[PDB]
Design a protein around this ligand. Structure first.
Ligand SMILES: CC(C)=CCC/C(C)=C/COP(=O)(O)OP(=O)(O)O
Ligand SMILES: CC(C)=CCC/C(C)=C/COP(=O)(O)OP(=O)(O)O
Ligand SMILES: [Mg+2]
Ligand SMILES: [Mg+2]
Ligand SMILES: [Mg+2]
Ligand SMILES: [Mg+2]
Ligand SMILES: [Mg+2]
Lengths: 273, 271
C-alpha cells in the first residue's frame, strides 16, 4: 500500500546509484564490469536498501544519508547470490527465470565479478564523498558490514547450510542457519541505515536490532509457507502461519515508542506476513 | 639482513593472523579451519614485509602496521584460493601442498576465501586492531578496496584469464599483482602517522618498480614471458633497471628506509 510506494521509491533510488558503479575504467575490463552489472541490475526487489532507508528515516534522518549503505548491502547480497548459484554450490541455471551469472558468462568470470562486488561494497562505505557521515560512523558501518558479510555471518551461514546436507535438522538448528545466512545481513541493513541517520543511540539501535531479528526470520517462515527441512514440515502449516504472525508482533513491539517516521518499518512487518 | 628482516615480519604477522581463525561457534569450525589452512601455509609474507618496511621508512614503529600487514596478506591469501580453483587454474597443489579445494572441498574453498576478503576489511575498520586516526583508517580501507577490486587485483585476474606484447603484459601485471603490492606499501606508510603526499608518491614509484621486478625476475629464473619478449639478456638488464628505479624513488629517505632498499636488491639478486 504505502509500503508498496515506499519500496518503489527505494528501488528506483538505489538502482540509479548502483547503475553508476559499473563503468569499466579501461577497455580490457569491459566484460568483467558487464558481468558485475548483470549480477546486480537484475530487477531485484531491493529489500535490504529499503531496510537501510527505512531505519535511517525511523530515527529521523533524511533518507539520502543512507544511499551508500543501501548500495553496500545490495552489493553484498548480489555477490552472495552469484556464488550460491555456482556449480560447486546450488548449480543453478536460472534465477527468477533469467540465466545466472555463470551461465550467461562463464564460471570464472562469475566468481570474479562477485569478488569485485564484495570489494566495491566496502569501497563505497569508506568513500567519504559517497558516504558522508562522521568518520567514526563510517568505520562502525564498515565494521558492521564486514562482520555481517563474513565467516561469522552470511558466509558462515552458507557453510552451515552446506554442512547440514543429509543431517537431520531441528528448528533450533534451522534458525541458527537462517540467522547467519540471511539474518546477519538484514540486521546490518537496519543497523547501517540507523547509523546513517546521524541520530543513532544505543537504545534505539538495540530496539531496531530486535525488529530486524524478528523480520529476518519472518521472511524465511513466510517463504516456506508460500512454497507450500522447512518451517511447515517442522511445525505443520497452521502452526507455521502462527509463528509468522508471532514474529510480526515481536517486530511491532520492538518499535514501541518510535515516532511516525518509523511507520514504513511497521508496514513492512505487517506486509511480510 | 633482508632475510632476518623477512623472518621477523613473518613471525609478527603470523602471530596476528593466527589469532583471527577462532570459530565463534561449533557449526563454523570447519569453515574457520579452511580459512586457517588457506593463510597459515608457510608463505613468505612479502606484502606484510612491505607494509612493515614502508611504515619504518617513514619513521613509524612497525607494530603500527600490524593491521595493514594482516589485511594485505588476507587479500593475497583469498586470491590464491580462488586462482587455484577448477574454474580458474585448477591446481591440486600450491607450493607442494594440497590446495584448499582438495583438502576440504570446492564450495568450502570458495567460501573460506570469501570470508578472508571480509575479514581483511573488518581488520582495518576495527579501531582497536588498527588504532590509527579515523581518517587514516578510512584512507587505508579505500586504498585496499580499490586495489583488491575489479579496478585492481580482480581486474588483473580477468585480464590474465582473458588473454600479447610487453605493454599488455605490463598492464596485466600492474593490475594482477601491482595494485596489491602498491597498497601494501601505501597502507604501511599511512600507518606510520607520518605520511605526506611527496613521500607517498615516492613510495608508490618504489612499489611500481619492485612489483614489476618480481615478475621479470621470476620469468628469468624459470628459463608470453619477459625473456621471450625482450630476449634473455635484455630481460636481465631490465630487472636491474627496475631495481634502480626503485632505489632512485627512495633518494633522500633516511636510513630507516634501508629494509626497502635491501628488498629491491634482493629481488633481482635471487638465484
Ligand atoms: C555465497 C553465500 C555467502 C551465500 C549466502 C547468502 C544467500 C542469500 C544464499 C541463497 O540461499 P538459497 O540458495 O537457499 O536461496 P535461493 O533459493 O535464492 O538460491
Ligand atoms: C582475484 C584473483 C583470484 C586474483 C588472483 C591473484 C593472483 C596473485 C594469482 C596468482 O597468479 P598465477 O595463477 O599466475 O600464479 P600461481 O602460479 O601462484 O597460481
Ligand atoms: Mg544455496
Ligand atoms: Mg540457491
Ligand atoms: Mg526456506
Ligand atoms: Mg595460479
Ligand atoms: Mg592464475
Amino acid at each position: 500500500s504505502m509500503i508498496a510506494a515506499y519500496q518503489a521509491r527505494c528501488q528506483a533510488r538505489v538502482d540509479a546509484a548502483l547503475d553508476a558503479l559499473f563503468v569499466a575504467p579501461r577497455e580490457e575490463l569491459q566484460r568483467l564490469y558487464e558481468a558485475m552489472r548483470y549480477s546486480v541490475m537484475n530487477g531485484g526487489k531491493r529489500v535490504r536498501p529499503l531496510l537501510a532507508y527505512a531505519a535511517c528515516e525511523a530515527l529521523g534522518g533524511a533518507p539520502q544519508r543512507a544511499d551508500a549503505a543501501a548500495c553496500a548491502v545490495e552489493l553484498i547480497h548480489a555477490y552472495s547470490l552469484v556464488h550460491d548459484d555456482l556449480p560447486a554450490m546450488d548449480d543453478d541455471d536460472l534465477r527468477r527465470g533469467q540465466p545466472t551469472t555463470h551461465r550467461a558468462f562463464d564460471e570464472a568470470t562469475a566468481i570474479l565479478a562477485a569478488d569485485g562486488l564484495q570489494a566495491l561494497a566496502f569501497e563505497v562505505l569508506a568513500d567519504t564523498r559517497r558516504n558522508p557521515q562522521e568518520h567514526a560512523v563510517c568505520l562502525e558501518m564498515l565494521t558492521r558490514l564486514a562482520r555481517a558479510a563474513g565467516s561469522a555471518g552470511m558466509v558462515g551461514g552458507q557453510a552451515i547450510d552446506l554442512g547440514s546436507v543429509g543431517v537431520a535438522l531441528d528448528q533450533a538448528a534451522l534458525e541458527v542457519m537462517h540467522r547467519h545466512k540471511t539474518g546477519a545481513l538484514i540486521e546490518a541493513s537496519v543497523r547501517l541505515g540507523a547509523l546513517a541517520s546521524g541520530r543513532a543511540e544505543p537504545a534505539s539501535l538495540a530496539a531496531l536490532e530486535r525488529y530486524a531479528e524478528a523480520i529476518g526470520l519472518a521472511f524465511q517462515v513466510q517463504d516456506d509457507i508460500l512454497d507450500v527441512p522447512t518451517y511447515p514440515a517442522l511445525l505443520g502449516l497452521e502452526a507455521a502461519k502462527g509463528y509468522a504472525l508471532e514474529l510480526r508482533d515481536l517486530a511491532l513491539a520492538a518499535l514501541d515508542g518510535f515516532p511516525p517516521s518509523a511507520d514504513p518499518l511497521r508496514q513492512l512487518a505487517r506486509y511480510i506476513v
